[PDB]
Design a protein around this nucleic acid. Structure first.
Ligand code: MG
Ligand code: ZN
Ligand code: ZN
Ligand code: ZN
Lengths: 193, 100, 294, 98, 44, 33, 46, 105, 115, 463, 54
DNA sequence: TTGTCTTCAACTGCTTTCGCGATGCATGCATGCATGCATGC
RNA sequence: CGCGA
């Protein structure tokens, strides 16, 4: 009837080869509309980075639905359509009230976007009684819940113990349950079942 | 995104229509009494906010005097966009526009 | 119609009423005597009549049609047919007092929403098409021939009060330091300081030394990153460099409002003009006042 | 008013429309069913016109916004009317079209 | 003796919770008498 | 000029609010909010 | 007369495009008197 | 400028979707989460999402009563005279919606 | 110019709500500079110079158990001209609930004065 | 008791599993009691509870288990608990934060808030941090804000400050990634206190306050600053980030002479520090687009640096200072022609600053200057006597003291002749600001004490 | 906090996002971090560890 | 029957700029003089 | 509907 589901990720992380995981790192061309401080009028690219981009680096974003790994191809859009894209001078509409210029900029973001059901690996910094901690790519902190752990496995004093009886170590394949961006930090919820 | 990529393509086309080419630019070569003001004003704000300043200050503590001082040299880096009533506009570099 | 949203008659029905947020409905204190917002009262009447029909219609509904006498209808089923007028009328009063029934043929109607906007102002031309402002001073003009025509005499009073903060840069820091050091009490002075975060620091309650602190402390970076683009703003007293905008009401034509370079004149409390302006402002220097805007 | 707080977005145009009750309920922070105003303690009567769900009041923090009196923008509530009421401004249009 | 009958001029002093009136006349309006105290004025 | 209340909206006090009629409210070191 | 216009104004679902100063005045934008006709556009290296 | 600054200038949240000044409000956040503005009209009761595919973590937000709301997260800051707000308040009482078309879209 | 100001702290009362407040200091702490302007009974000394914000009265409150103060509102410095202790009818028993105060204000021929 | 309490809280969890949460709250009530209230949860129950909560933490996670978690985290003086309780507490915090690194933020907030304490109470905190930071890298950003959001006010007591600052130094080594905004936060408050004093000459307080922290810092600095740190250590980048903050933050401050000795202090720890710090000052002074007043003060800092400094190869000093004279010689050529042109002598102010620089250089002459042959380096006697009577007349325009200083020992050393031309200055004798510019030498005998003696090696008594 | 100074006004993906090979990621992280040589400092610290993964 | 311009005539909106500036009626405490009730010797 | 051009 009524679709609010028009916000969804139709890109799915494909299971890679040679490997069993999926690539959640992705390049998204985007358009943002930002401000330019008056001091950077001689370094507009340099400014926008310091002014806008750089803070986004390695933080989650709702639009892209991931953590920003970095950016490529920053392009300020000259106000004049007539000017060829080669022109070294571009035009920035100044705010009527204030000296700050506002403009559109095109840039390519590399973003790691874990979805649900994605297959991932990560090292284990701590095996708790409740869970298993995971640094994903030595950055993203992931956790595997107790109930999510198959009950046949055990934890001793300490360290976990699998079905085969050994403790488990280091890189661990797991399936994503949820991704928690509500906290200041991303939290990747994986599951082994 | 395609819907956004759409009206971005729509943004250009209309804004292509609304631009008047240099040769096609039909309005007065003079700087209107108003254009002079706001230029001085806008340039003054930026000068006040530590925008780069092309001409020596020589003891001007007043950004607006400074803005005036650049304008004598046409060192002001701005562009006036003159709207015809339809919304199609022109673009005049400051320096190319005859002062008073 | 691009949305292609259909037209629904529910428009004219005016069912539920939107309650203005508390802050616009705040009470009214006349002297120390306080009074609830008049509009709240007009709301209350609806609220009263609301639960009335709510509860009243509830009882007749509970009344069993067999247990209901056909007279038990005429006492109630006809009774709702009255209050319906009130609840429909209370709505009117709440909006248009003119569409409201007379209360005791006198006591005046309480102004409705419609009356707040319209009559003789009621709002648009009171608080929108014109407004009371800031950094403006009204006082009495005095003829001074010695200033220049474009200039304007400013009493030190206004010199001390009015303040136009200047974006802390380079060229200005030589002044603004001294401008801060001087004090709100000593012209050319300075009053507040806007840090980069937007916080204000008043200089009023400060002696000179820990004030000289701020002056020296003034131009310096700030660790906060979002503020790296910004510089401190100081609120200097108006000074001879500044321009004001003078107005003598009524304003018949634009020339009755002109800009003036400021000359700060010591010793007196009156705005003072050269004569060339008089013909424009049409000002006789008989108890004349003019509005200074900064 | 400060130039250091640039306002990026701007209002191009304003559209006139009528609030539909379906909207009004969804967008109402509270319902006001109670003609009562203030208790004896002076606290706002819940369900009354001053209910803190409409915003902060006195020192009492906002229910809805949660902010104090200074920063709480205020929030608008709805009064459900037992009867559909003729919108007085229109009415004539109602009257004519009917 | 801080006070004066607003009528008979009789000088008087009062106390906390005291009838405000002239102990002689009874006029309930009273004046506060000025007492020796140092106040500065410039002759300009 | 005192009212003690409302500490100070600056986390290097909290130092101690008096309100001026102009509504700045002022704390001793000299925040005006 | 506000409402009578305002009424008719709503009845047409009238979009107001903010041209007249009084309109612009209300919203709080710039005006089309003069000092608000031409747009100031900066320039920049690249 | 003079008029605006001497008569009321702030800036305000508006839903670039629901096109309203009033329906916006702060979010009551979690520990570990900053508050944010959301538009009430364009926000839904969280109950509705799980009724009918998974829901984005951030789209949920909680009111002063902690009620999880989904959507209504599209807001800007626009500089208006304050009385404009009060004006809408009045027209809202009359049931009259003012939709504010905002750029950038 | 003489502006005569009436200070009544019994207006709030409801003609029986028992006396809440009393012109004077309380035993509590109070800034003690008030002694300069205000006399020992909480009233100001006759003829005392006054500028804005200075104490024009000292009334102790029982409820708040505070010694509170009325201050001089006008920005133009005035003098204390007269102080009038006003008792009330209904057979005494009523302490001082109201005072009227003349302020004396110097007026000279300042610039701007119509003659 | 123990078995009761266990089954009590285990039943409570099922209440939250059944959404009741009442016992959860009541439990959360007890644990939220202050450290003072005897009704606070006893250690053994908390011991039981922690491990139970550390058993399945995912049984807790919900809006309902939330309030419990707060009281847990908001439990006061957790660092004062018996170690096993403290361990299980720590062992618990590790679990939840690793499960949902949401609470770590206000956990860290508390950890940050504790930095006001001395080192001992804060060790577990630092221990807690230096783990999670490396483990939860994204923490680095907002924890810094907590370093920012929590700093003691100036007016606040030193007890927090000097212990807080020290705690920062404590963490500073634990995370070199931040490494910067620390100093930024430091130097500001450091400056913020510095400027308070100068105009005063509460005084005794900030005097003590500041002195406690500076000597705290310079010590921590001289500790972290060592030649072995100049190679594989980070002192290089640290020396860099200090110079930048000096350049960015310290240089622009006005008449501030309290913490600019810091770089003076450290750069005297090593001559490379001296060198690498010296090349910067020269680059700052002669930069083209910088403000002449900045240039002037650049030669005021650099100027008043050298001859109050101790550890520096003297020969390093002379050449560029002699190139300065060459710089002065290239200066005099293009300019004396402008002297007679329309304008005043203050047009040349950058010279007199460089000349005010050299009359301070004259301080070293008295000590050691006359080479082996006695001759003055680069023919000083003839060099100045020409430049002295030059259209600059540099004697007239510079400081009242150091020019008179330059006056005495020069002719005593037979450098040049002044008092004759000095009298020629007084008889012939933007304006006042200019006077104030040079007069201040941002090095001078300190009014402090312990750090003052720390500089005794570093300082040259004028006597 | 978040203002128009530090924050974009509005952001839109112009296209459907494109997955990337590790080499590209390597090339990027290489080039990206390289091009970066202050909040920049704290985050690239992660990136170094992130490329250290690969 | 019936069309409609015809006519008079019931409703209804605004007005040169700013500052200086509720009535009546029942309830109960208040006052004063004279019996009763409680403390003390 | 009082005071000022
Ligand atoms: Mg006249
Ligand atoms: Zn008497
Ligand atoms: Zn404070
Ligand atoms: Zn919305």
């Amino acid at each position: 009837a009524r679709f609010i589901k028009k916000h969804k990720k139709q890109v799915t992380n494909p299971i890679d080869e040679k490997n069993g995981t999926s690539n959640c790192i992705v390049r998204v061309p985007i358009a943002l509309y930002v401000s330019l401080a008056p001091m950077y009028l001689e370094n507009p690219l340099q400014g926008v980075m310091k002014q806008h981009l750089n803070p986004l680096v390695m933080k989650y974003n709702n639009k892209v639905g991931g953590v920003v790994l970095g950016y490529e191809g920053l392009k300020i859009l000259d106000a004049d359509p007539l000017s060829k894209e080669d022109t070294s001078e571009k035009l920035i509409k100044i705010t009527p009230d204030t000296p700050f210029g506002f403009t559109w900029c095109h840039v390519n973001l590399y973003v790691w976007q874990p979805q649900v059901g994605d297959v991932l690996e990560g090292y284990i910094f701590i095996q708790s009684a409740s869970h298993i901690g995971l640094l994903i790519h030595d950055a993203f902190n992931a956790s595997i819940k107790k109930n999510n752990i198959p009950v046949d496995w055990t934890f001793v004093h300490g360290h976990w113990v699998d079905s085969n009886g050994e403790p488990i170590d280091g890189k661990l394949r797991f399936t994503v349950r949820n991704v928690h961006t509500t906290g200041r930090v991303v939290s990747v919820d994986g599951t082994l079942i | 995104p395609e819907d956004f990529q759409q009206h971005e393509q729509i943004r250009r086309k209309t804004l292509k229509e609304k631009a008047i080419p240099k040769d096609q630019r039909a309005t007065t070569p003079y700087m209107t009494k108003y254009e002079r003001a706001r230029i001085l004003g806008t340039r003054a704000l930026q000068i006040s906010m530590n925008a780069p300043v092309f001409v020596d200050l020589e003891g001007e503590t007043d950004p607006l005097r400074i803005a005036m001082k650049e304008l004598a040299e046409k060192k002001i880096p701005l562009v006036i966009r003159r709207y015809l009533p339809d919304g199609s506009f022109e673009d005049w570099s400051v320096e190319e526009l005859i002062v008073d | 119609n691009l949305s292609r949203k259909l037209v629904k008659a529910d428009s004219f029905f005016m069912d539920v009423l939107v309650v203005p947020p508390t802050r616009f409905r705040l009470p009214s204190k006349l002297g120390e005597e306080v009074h609830e917002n008049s509009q709240n009262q007009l709301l209350s009447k609806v609220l009263t009549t609301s639960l009335l029909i709510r509860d009243l219609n509830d009882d007749l509904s509970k009344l069993q049609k067999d247990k209901v006498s056909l007279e038990d209808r005429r006492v109630i089923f006809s009774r709702l047919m009255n209050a319906f007028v009130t609840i429909q009328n209370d709505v009117n009063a709440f909006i248009d007092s003119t569409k409201a029934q007379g209360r005791t043929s006198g006591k005046v109607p309480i102004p409705g929403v419609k009356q707040a906007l319209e009559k003789k102002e009621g709002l648009f031309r009171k608080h929108m098409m014109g407004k009371r402002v800031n950094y403006a001073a009204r006082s009495v003009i005095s003829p001074d021939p010695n200033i220049e025509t474009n200039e304007i005499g400013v009493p030190p009073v206004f010199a001390v009060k009015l303040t136009y903060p200047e974006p802390v840069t380079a060229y200005n820091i030589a002044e603004l330091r001294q401008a801060v050091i001087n004090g709100p009490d000593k012209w050319p002075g300075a009053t507040q300081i806007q840090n980069e975060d937007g916080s204000l620091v008043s200089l009023i309650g400060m002696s000179v030394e820990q004030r000289k602190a701020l002056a020296n402390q003034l131009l310096t970076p700030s660790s906060n990153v979002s503020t790296h683009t910004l510089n401190k703003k100081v609120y200097r007293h108006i000074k001879n460099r500044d321009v004001v905008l003078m107005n003598r009401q009524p304003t018949l034509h634009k020339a009755s409002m002109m800009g003036h370079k400021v000359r700060v004149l010591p010793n007196e409390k009156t705005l003072r003009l050269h004569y060339a302006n008089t013909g424009a402002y049409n000002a006789d220097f008989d108890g004349d006042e003019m509005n200074m805007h900064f | 008013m400060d130039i250091s707080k640039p306002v990026g977005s701007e209002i191009t145009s304003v559209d006139f429309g009528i609030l539909t009750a379906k909207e009004i309920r969804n967008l109402s922070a509270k319902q006001i069913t109670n003609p009562t105003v203030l208790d004896n303690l002076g606290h706002p009567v819940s369900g009354g016109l001053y209910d803190l769900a409409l915003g902060a009041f006195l020192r009492n923090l906002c229910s809805t916004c949660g902010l104090d009196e200074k920063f709480c923008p205020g929030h608008q509530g709805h009064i459900e009317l037992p009867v559909p009421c003729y919108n007085p401004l229109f009415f004539n249009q109602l009257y004519i079209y009917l | 003796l801080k006070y004066i009958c607003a009528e008979c001029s009789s000088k008087l002093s009062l106390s906390r919770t005291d009838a405000v009136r002239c102990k002689d006349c009874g006029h309930r309006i009273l004046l506060k008498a000025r007492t020796k105290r140092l106040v500065q004025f410039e002759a300009r | 000029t005192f009212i003690r209340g409302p500490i100070c909206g600056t986390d290097n006090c909290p130092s101690r609010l008096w309100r001026i009629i102009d509504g700045r409210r002022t704390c001793q070191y000299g925040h005006v909010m | 007369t506000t409402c009578q216009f305002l009424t008719k104004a709503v009845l047409d679902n009238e979009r107001e495009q903010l041209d007249s100063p009084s309109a612009r005045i209300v919203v709080g934008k710039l005006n089309n008197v003069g000092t608000g006709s031409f747009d100031v556009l900066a320039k920049v290296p690249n | 400028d003079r008029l605006l600054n001497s008569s009321d200038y702030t800036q305000a949240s508006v839903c670039r979707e629901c096109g309203s000044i009033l329906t916006t409000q702060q979010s009551v956040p979690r520990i570990g989460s900053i508050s944010t503005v959301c538009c009430r009209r364009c926000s839904m009761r969280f109950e509705d999402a799980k009724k009918l595919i998974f829901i984005d973590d951030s789209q949920i937000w909680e009111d002063g009563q902690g009620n999880k709301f989904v959507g209504g997260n599209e807001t800007t800051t626009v500089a208006i005279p304050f009385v404009l707000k009060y004006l809408d308040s009045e027209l809202s009482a009359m049931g009259i919606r003012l939709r504010y078309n905002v750029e950038p879209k | 110019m003489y502006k005569t100001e009436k200070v009544d702290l019994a207006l709030n009362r409801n003609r029986g709500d028992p006396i809440t407040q009393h012109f004077g200091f309380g035993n509590d702490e109070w800034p003690k500079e008030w002694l300069e302007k205000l006399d020992e009974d909480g009233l100001p000394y006759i003829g005392t110079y006054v500028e804005e914000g200075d104490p024009i009265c000292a009334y102790f409150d029982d409820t708040l158990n505070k010694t509170k103060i009325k201050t001089y509102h006008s920005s133009e410095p005035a003098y204390i001209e007269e102080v009038n202790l006003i008792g009330d009818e209904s057979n005494k028993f009523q302490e001082l609930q109201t005072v009227s105060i003349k302020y004396r204000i110097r007026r000279t021929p300042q610039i701007g004065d119509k003659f | 008791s123990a078995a009761m309490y266990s089954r009590f809280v285990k039943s409570a969890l099922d209440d939250l599993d059944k959404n009741d949460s009442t016992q959860i709250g009541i439990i959360a009530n007890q644990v939220a009691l202050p450290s003072k209230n005897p009704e606070r949860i006893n250690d053994k129950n908390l011991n039981i509870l922690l491990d139970i909560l550390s058993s399945n933490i995912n049984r807790i996670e919900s809006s309902r288990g939330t309030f419990l978690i707060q009281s847990i985290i908001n439990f006061e003086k957790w660092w004062e608990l018996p170690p096993h309780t403290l361990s299980k507490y720590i062992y618990f915090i590790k679990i939840l934060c690793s499960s949902i690194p949401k609470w770590w933020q206000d956990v860290s907030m508390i950890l940050v808030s504790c930095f006001i304490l001395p080192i001992k109470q804060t060790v577990c905190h630092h221990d807690m941090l230096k783990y999670f930071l490396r483990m939860i890298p994204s923490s680095m950003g907002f924890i810094d804000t907590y370093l920012a959001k929590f700093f003691p006010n100036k007016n606040d007591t030193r007890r927090k400050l000097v212990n807080y600052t020290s705690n920062l130094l404590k963490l500073r080594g634990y995370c070199s990634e931040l490494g910067f905004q620390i100093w930024s936060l430091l130097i500001e408050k450091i400056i913020s206190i510095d400027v308070e004093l100068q105009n005063e000459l509460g005084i005794k307080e900030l005097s003590t306050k500041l002195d406690s922290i500076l000597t705290l810092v310079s010590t921590h600095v001289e500790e972290q600053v060592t030649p072995e740190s100049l190679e594989s250590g980070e002192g290089v980048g640290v020396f860099n980030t200090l110079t930048t903050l000096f350049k960015t933050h310290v240089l622009p401050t006005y008449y501030t002479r309290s913490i600019q000795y810091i770089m003076f202090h450290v750069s005297q720890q090593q001559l490379e520090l001296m060198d690498s710090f010296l090349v910067t000052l020269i680059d700052i002074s002669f930069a083209v687009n910088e403000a002449a007043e900045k240039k002037i003060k650049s030669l005021q800092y650099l100027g008043s640096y050298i001859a109050r400094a101790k550890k520096l190869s003297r020969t390093q000093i002379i050449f560029v200072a002699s190139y300065l004279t060459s710089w002065l010689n290239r200066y005099v050529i293009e300019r004396e022609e402008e002297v007679d042109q329309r304008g005043g002598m203050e047009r040349f102010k950058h010279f007199y600053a460089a000349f005010q620089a050299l009359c301070y250089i004259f301080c070293f002459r008295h000590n050691i200057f006359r080479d082996t042959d006695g001759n003055w380096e680069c023919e000083l006697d003839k060099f100045f006597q020409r430049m002295v009577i030059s259209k600059f007349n540099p004697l007239k325009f510079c400081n009242e003291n150091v020019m008179l200083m330059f006056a005495r020992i020069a002719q005593q050393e037979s450098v040049a002749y002044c008092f004759s031309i000095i009298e020629n200055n007084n008889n012939e004798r933007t304006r006042q600001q200019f006077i104030d510019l040079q007069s201040y030498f941002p090095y001078d005998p300190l009014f402090l004490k312990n750090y003052k003696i720390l500089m005794k090696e570093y300082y040259i008594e004028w006597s | 906090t978040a203002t128009t100074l530090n924050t974009p006004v509005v952001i839109h993906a112009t296209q459907l996002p494109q997955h990337v090979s590790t080499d590209e990621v390597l090339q990027f992280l290489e080039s990206f971090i390289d091009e970066k040589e202050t909040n920049l400092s704290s985050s690239i610290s992660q990136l170094k560890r992130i490329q250290r993964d690969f």
